[PDB]
Amino acid sequence: TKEALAGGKILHNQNVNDWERVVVTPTADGGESRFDGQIIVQMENDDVVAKAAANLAGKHPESSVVVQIDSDGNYRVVYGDPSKLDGKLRWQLVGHGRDDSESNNTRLSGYSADELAVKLAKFQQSFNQAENINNKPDHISIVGASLVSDDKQKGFGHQFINAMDANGLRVDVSVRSSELAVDEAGRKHTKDANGDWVQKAENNKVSLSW
Numbered sequence: 001t002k003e004a005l006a007g008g009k010i011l012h013n014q015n016v017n018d019w020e021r022v023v024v025t026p027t028a029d030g031g032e033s034r035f036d037g038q039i040i041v042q043m044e045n046d047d048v049v050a051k052a053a054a055n056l057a058g059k060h061p062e063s064s065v066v067v068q069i070d071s072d073g074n075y076r077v078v079y080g081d082p083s084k085l086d087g088k089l090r091w092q093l094v095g096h097g098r099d100d101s102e103s104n105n106t107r108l109s110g111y112s113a114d115e116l117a118v119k120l121a122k123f124q125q126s127f128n129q130a131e132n133i134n135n136k137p138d139h140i141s142i143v144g145a146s147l148v149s150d151d152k153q154k155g156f157g158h159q160f161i162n163a164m165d166a167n168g169l170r171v172d173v174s175v176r177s178s179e180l181a182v183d184e185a186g187r188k189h190t191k192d193a194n195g196d197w198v199q200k201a202e203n204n205k206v207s208l209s210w
């Protein structure tokens with residue numbers, strides 16, 4: 001059964017050292033990725049979020065690093081080796097989207113688009129300093145429900161791509177206007193107009209670029 005990343009329970013994003021850690025099970029049918037490595041960034045201490053982050057890493061088990069990061073900016077690596085992060089990198093940000101508006105959700109794991117950009121910019125420098133690694137992403141995949149407007153023209157993803165650039169991270173951003181879930185193979189599902197979970201519905205996502 002799919003569990004949406006659309007909120008519904010209380011946000012717990014503080015004190016990373018007190019978060020659950022879940023097992024990543026490598027799946028062997030992940031195929032090829034354009035990214036040489038990736039960071040899965042788990043943004044809150046919630047079972048749906050933690051499982052989704054672990055399942056994404058399991059799709060590319062040899063080149064994925066999972067980080068948990070809290071409201072104070074403290075982070076820890078819970079899967080993978082940062083030394084694999086060389087080349088064309090993606091970050092997949094995993095959290096619940098919440099706080100609806102005319103342009104859909106306004107917060108991912110409690111963070112506005114501006115706040116999220118600041119957090120990620122600090123994290124890039126902290127991670128690079130502590131791990132001695134350039135983790136600079138080319139692409140951010142926002143793995144949370146309904147973080148761009150239905151027509152794909154407004155909302156969180158648009159404010160986020162600009163705020164990221166303002167904070168020194170020029171990235172492409174993929175983001176979904178619908179509810180979103182991650183399955184046991186690390187593949188994403190969105191909800192269609194009928195409320196049914198589907199895969200590869202390109203109409204539910206947009207890739208914002210420069």
Ligand SMILES: O=P(O)(O)O[C@H]1[C@H](OP(=O)(O)O)[C@@H](OP(=O)(O)O)[C@H](OP(=O)(O)O)[C@@H](OP(=O)(O)O)[C@H]1OP(=O)(O)O
Pocket residue numbers: 030031032033034035059090139141174175186187188189199200205
């Ligand atoms: O090649 P596929 O097996 O079809 O997997 C794709 C691919 O991810 P991989 O890197 O794991 O191959 C996409 O990556 P892009 O190069 O297009 O960026 C990703 O898109 P996002 O990066 O935007 O997350 C997409 O996810 P989506 O379902 O949202 O299209 C995902 O497909 P799966 O969901 O089946 O893993």
Ligand code: NA
Pocket residue numbers: 030031032033034
């Ligand atoms: Na692929």
